[model samples]
Target chain A: SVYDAAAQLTADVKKDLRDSWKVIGSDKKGNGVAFMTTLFADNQETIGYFKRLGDVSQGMANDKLRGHSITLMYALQNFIDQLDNPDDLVCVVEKFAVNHITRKISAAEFGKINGPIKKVLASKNFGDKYANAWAKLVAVVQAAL
Target chain B: SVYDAAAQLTADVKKDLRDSWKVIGSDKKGNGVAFMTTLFADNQETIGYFKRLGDVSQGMANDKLRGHSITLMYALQNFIDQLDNPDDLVCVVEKFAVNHITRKISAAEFGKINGPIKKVLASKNFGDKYANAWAKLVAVVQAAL
Candidate 1:
């Protein structure tokens, strides 16, 4: 079952995170935002992906996948940009990469899942600033996941 | 530690939902757009209880909790009133309840979270059903998480 495969992968990824990542202060130095990160439009991607993945693996449960995706989405949201601050973002991303890869998300799968999405996003003629920001965001998430 | 604990909890909850809830279809016959449980002002009591729970669990990751809550909220908004239909509502509630219990969310806790939020909702005194719906929308979320 894919679930079994996912479970094994999750374990390996967790191991990598545990072995490599170190925790630092959550406080955002001057702002005291206390680990605050931008709430990007990631969940929509997650839910959408799971919906599609669920279709592929019909044996997998929807609510369960949604629930897992929610957690993954949440963690990714919180940690994805950690690399941005030159503070903890690097550590966070490295750990996240370990976790995601361990969970069996290959570079190929990651690109396959995320690349087209990014391309579609890039194609949008919205103001360049936001589009540029999205381009960076996509790069960051793709690298991390 | 809390992040790990919550992540694990979230993952477990999601798995349970997938395994148990998604396939549990509504009982209503011949209706593709059957509604589920709706929370009008009359449903303020339920909302009140829900708000209290969120307060009590104030230590949680609001983003993670909020993300999941939002999904559920969207579902509720789309189908709350449909719950009155035996074919539609009963099955939905049953699955929701099952998912709640499986996640170790107690009835008592549910009450704590929603109670105060609902009270605030009632205070809005929405006169026009259309305008009032907007007013209640915030209250619905306030109560849930």
Candidate 2:
């Protein structure tokens, strides 16, 4: 099923994701904090997973917040960069899941963050074509978990 | 002269900066702070340029420090990414100089930081070839100022 989902990745999907990322990456001063902050705000309990975030003042520019935000964004961007290698894509998603498992992040919690992320993409003017591509990618990631 | 100096950039130097950046990018817990901290340590007065760094505690993970460190490294990396286009590289350098001018950063203060930066690169195992490339690049930056 994961392989099937991965197979569904078309060139158009890749192109759309790139277009969408350009917006997300540039949105709000090119720091992905606003998108990430929205995720944490909607999912308050998710905030505790980050000790660095707890120490910093609560805001977009908060040190830990920005650090983690950029880290996650970069990770996602790297994953997209590997889109051509379905096996590598699968391996990265599995690794991502394992890395977060120690932090008590289950698939469901990881899945929850996707909704907010998609919303942020949509707000940045990504339409159905981009949304559909993103949804498929997110679905594959969720299925991998 | 700027173009002439830029012309001196060898593949080894470009490779070295790219290679060394992986360490700098990951150093101090991948926060980009250690490199910046090293830069600030050797040139203490340069620390005043950042308002956020003033209020934060001093450490690798100190929120503001890490945030600014990554930002600076990314900026430098972008410049390197433009290496194929010497004209674009010079434009970015000129823009960087103009941006710093508003903060009252003179060419002298800016030039002073390169020594510490080069030292850090050299300490990270970059040999003289890379050093010479970096030196030429820095000279071009200084000339632009």
Candidate 3:
């Protein structure tokens, strides 16, 4: 039997990641802040969910904004670390998706958020080949949402 | 008691990282592999450490290379995540440095590796604002070597 391509693909992409984490790890705070701001910048409505952001237009400099960003970055790091394990990956994303339901976040917003996020990644030199792989995983998460 | 600027600076940098983890989280594997390959590419001699890589020029396609990259990425992630805790951070980096000596990796080489590793990070869009923090930690580790 042929080895599972998706699993293989996952492994290929996972290995590819090692070459570039320093970029992300280097300025974790900055990257995290930039990402959250991008989400708000793209979809101002979603900002309503974050009680701490107050006025989203104030951008990413506020104390609460910064705290929230760091928290999410840490959380995302945990989620990313778990991607290799399919059961765990699905569980984590599903848990996140379900949690968001109470906050009124929809798959539609997730779809919208993907654009700015991709733009940010591209800016950081994250390439298209891996983008597709990410897109697939994202779609899986959004589907659960 | 006065605030420790080094600790404060580290905290500020960590806090500023509030923006865009989704992009990084999106492709953990790919990014991890990219990071490892960059290290090997930048310091070809280090390739001697990984017997699985065969010919380092072949890139990160091999199964063994993928696993190794993922493992290192995970370890590095833990290291990066613990930066705020200086005592723990020093302990971790020191341990890694000592471990490297057993493999014949030197303090000077470890220092040299920082440049390419930092280059890869900067390329991935990790801003320069916190390079010093990383440099400081890296130096601490190299000192042990």
Candidate 4:
């Protein structure tokens, strides 16, 4: 199961860090429109260091989010086009967070959305500690008045 | 199909009336439960009739607040009940409405209660009408809520 494998991997990674950490997760697709604030994990820049995730395994690359990663890659890369020197700095934290955060399309339903997104974020080393997925999950609620 | 039949019957009955008269409906079974009033299709009476409909139907019995029959029945009974000496006659409107409206039971559901107690009321013409069937209707509302 995804949970078992992810748990094992997380345990192994945490061994070396021996330090405290927090994880935040947000999926590509959301059932309804929502917005949240940036977060930190284990006192480290979680979303800031997301680009290190290059490996795509077991046809995960063929998944909708992964297959379209190239588009996000180039689109995010193009954001640096206006910069004075692109070669010297691959990408900045603010620009990466802004671009990726803005491009977030939809996440799944409430509880259902968390697990998969957590695994992906962990796999990519994005916010593996302190960062919360629901830091600012907001959606319009309706009822009989 | 029922709506069409009801519409046609109401029209035919109105056309058949030679002069202004009243039609009071009663489901007098065990201890006698009735909804009686006087009217000649006057619009104001019709409007006031609906307003007087107690919470019984609002919650459970005959749950359709906007139905023409519901409004008519409430009006007829309220009109007749008020004519009697106020000190002698106590209005049963609130209790009936509470069973249907507040309790969310329908006219048909009331019929179920009325059916078993039929022997107690000892009325020969124990049949069902919009008001009588309110018990069943109220049941639907209860289920939904």
Candidate 5:
């Protein structure tokens, strides 16, 4: 919906999503946090945006990282919870972007998390359809930026 | 858990919480946003904390406010999701505090939220037990600072 590059979230895509997170429980244990861990590992600059969760180059064991990861997953949970209502869904994803927008965090930086999100889901053997489903899901969030 | 002033989360207190948010869904709609509105409204100084969501003295109907309220409720959702895992629960709320700590936001400012939260919940007819339950919940979060 963002660029018309992503598919409109149809019933099939939403069901595809429901089953995947249903499998993950947003955790599936470390998978939830793994998304952020890999995200910072892959995109070090993205780490710079969070003034508080600083200096993870040493390692990512601290509370700020752990807590942010926890918050990010819950953001997804919030998205999923509102999936049935697309208008509300738009608002939820936009919330993820609006604050970042103020700080000059652009779509390109926020989009960095997509690979990590897909990577975690892919590790669990999510089908191509499920991966595609998540791409559409993330597309909307980035579009909001 | 942070200061030892807050009661250790008991099964009863946790349920007291679960039932309350269960009624609210962290919302029960505008109530979710209401906490932030009042926080910013009553404590005008808190608005200065968010540089991006700036100049709300004009009004608060914008995306940043909506998105932040959305995120805050999801933070609560995240906490409630891990109510059984007290260790993880502690980490979740601390995430809410730690980042703010870096910005030099104090426990007193964070505590400003307590009354607004209590008011919203109490408005819903959340009984004294529920209000006290939330007080303990917020106490631990503040203690983290």
Candidate 6:
């Protein structure tokens, strides 16, 4: 799946991606904070992993969680930014996946963010249709991890 | 050398690159033609290698020469386009180097085009100073090959 991400991001879907990104991508930091907040809400494994990974607490008011949230948002932005340039996007995404693997993250644990992410996208702030568009892309990418 | 291309293309030099590309890059096909023209002029090794590699003559009118010339111009544009985005640029440049090596092209023969490229860039349509900026980047990339 990761191997075919470039082809996956073919011209047929770039418009959908840009439309989705434009709608949900405006609140880079806010969406990120919400992302982590949701992930930690009911998921102890995601909470514990980030605690170990960043030495941060799972609390909503925690600055470290907010900091890591911004990082995740920017990571999404990077992939979104490069979708129009898929050869470069492939390299960026490949290295992103490999580095996460190198950090000893399990695919399941590494993917914990997607639920929070999809929920964030599903909010009426953008509408629900685009949520499906982004979640599928996110699923394939995280699945490949 | 390819490793350092990102740092070498810092913001301090990106403006000059864009200005240079604005001038020489407009004639992508023409510049590529002149690139090979100069490389082939009395450079027996380069001439013989391409003659063997592409099974085409060094003649200016050769269709293969024009075809490859366009390919070269686009390759140049790819680097120039990505100069503004370094991480993506690094991956693009790295894979570019690896692919050339995979194709069995020698660095010495690979290095032959820079001379023609520099000369083409030096044409009065632009100025000579900008050519220095480009040739150095090209030299490092080709040298890394």
Candidate with top DockQ is 5
Top lDDT prediction, candidate number? 5
Chain B, candidate 6: TM?
A: 0.81
State in Å the error of residue B44, model 4.
Answer: 37
All candidates: DockQ? 0.03, 0.04, 0.03, 0.00, 0.55, 0.03
Of 2 and 4, the candidate ranking higher by TM-score: 2
TM-score of candidate 6 on Cα atoms, chains taken together: 0.47
Instruction: Give residue A25's lDDT in candidate 3 (0 to 100).
Output: 47
- Docking quality of model 2: it rates as incorrect
lDDT of 5 at B39: 78
**TM-score, one value per model:** 0.28, 0.51, 0.46, 0.16, 0.80, 0.47
lDDT of 3 by residue, B70-125 (tens): 44554455555665665444444544554488778876877765665466557667
Better of 5 and 6 by DockQ: 5
Estimate, for each residue in B15-71, the C-alpha lDDT of model 6 and write its tens digit: 877887787777755676777777777475666556532544544466456545655
For residues A41-140, write the lDDT of model 6, one tens digit per residue: 7585655555433544544355455445545555576666656655445545654565477667777776666677668777836445555556656654
List candidate 3 stretches off by more than 4 Å.
Answer: A1-9, A16-22, B1-145
TM-score of chain A, cand. 2: 0.81
How much is B98 displaced in model 2, in angstroms? 35
Error of 3 at B78 (Å): 9.4
The i-RMS of candidate 3 is 10.3
Candidate-wise lDDT, in order? 0.34, 0.64, 0.58, 0.28, 0.72, 0.62
RMSD of 6: 10.9
Worst 10 residues of 5 chain B by lDDT: B54-63
What is the iRMSD in Å for candidate 2? 12.8
lDDT of 4 by residue, A20-83 (tens): 1122112211111111111222213333333333322212322322323322322222222212
